[PDB]
Design a protein around this ligand. Structure first.
Ligand SMILES: [Fe+3]
Length: 200
């Protein structure tokens, strides 16, 4: 059976062996739109992705399952070429009353509006699919508005800034065959063009 019929089995927990790595053709393919109302595979696929991000963020399940920690994940990294992403972003400590800043599976997500202003994480970016070091500022839009459908096949619109905007952009890129290192300037990886906001 397919990566999707396999991952959606009730017994299946997503781990690192389900995540394909830089070099695999499916990471460079343009993902397929999902059709609505959502089939149950697409629905379970999303719950599994969010459960993987929980697992990967919990010290005890992570070390035991041998997971590398994450806050976003996209179906193409599971060798399922569909426009599906999961984001699971914890609220900052200073330990929060509400666990997560953003927790969402997005179907056919796309940027319909973005700020002129660019931004990048100061510490660069990483990817579960990238098993090497790639240093440099990954240049993104500071703010974005996304159109997407939720698990209820309901059309949503959401405005994002800072850290969550970066994450969502990262994951949407996967659905378009684009890897973070594509947005690093190879000439000077730590070049700051005027205007660039760094997220420290
Ligand atoms: Fe990634």
């Amino acid at each position: 059976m397919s990566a999707i019929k396999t991952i959606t089995k009730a017994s299946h927990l997503i781990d690192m062996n389900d995540i394909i790595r830089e070099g695999h053709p499916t990471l460079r393919a343009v993902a397929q739109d999902v059709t609505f109302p959502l089939n149950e595979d697409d629905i379970i696929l999303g719950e599994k992705m969010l459960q993987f991000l929980k697992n990967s963020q919990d010290p005890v399940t992570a070390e035991k399952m041998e997971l590398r920690g994450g806050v976003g994940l996209a179906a193409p990294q599971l060798d399922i070429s569909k426009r599906i992403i999961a984001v699971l972003i914890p609220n900052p400590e200073d330990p929060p009353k509400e666990a997560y800043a953003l927790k969402e599976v997005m179907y056919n997500p796309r940027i319909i509006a973005h700020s002129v202003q660019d931004a990048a994480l100061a510490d660069g970016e990483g990817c579960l699919s990238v098993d090497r070091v790639v240093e440099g500022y990954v240049i993104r839009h500071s703010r974005v508005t996304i159109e997407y459908y939720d698990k209820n096949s309901d059309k949503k619109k959401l405005k994002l800034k800072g850290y969550q905007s970066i994450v969502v952009q990262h994951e949407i890129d996967h659905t378009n065959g684009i890897m973070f290192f594509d947005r690093i300037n190879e000439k000077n990886p730590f070049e700051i063009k005027e205007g660039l906001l760094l997220i420290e």
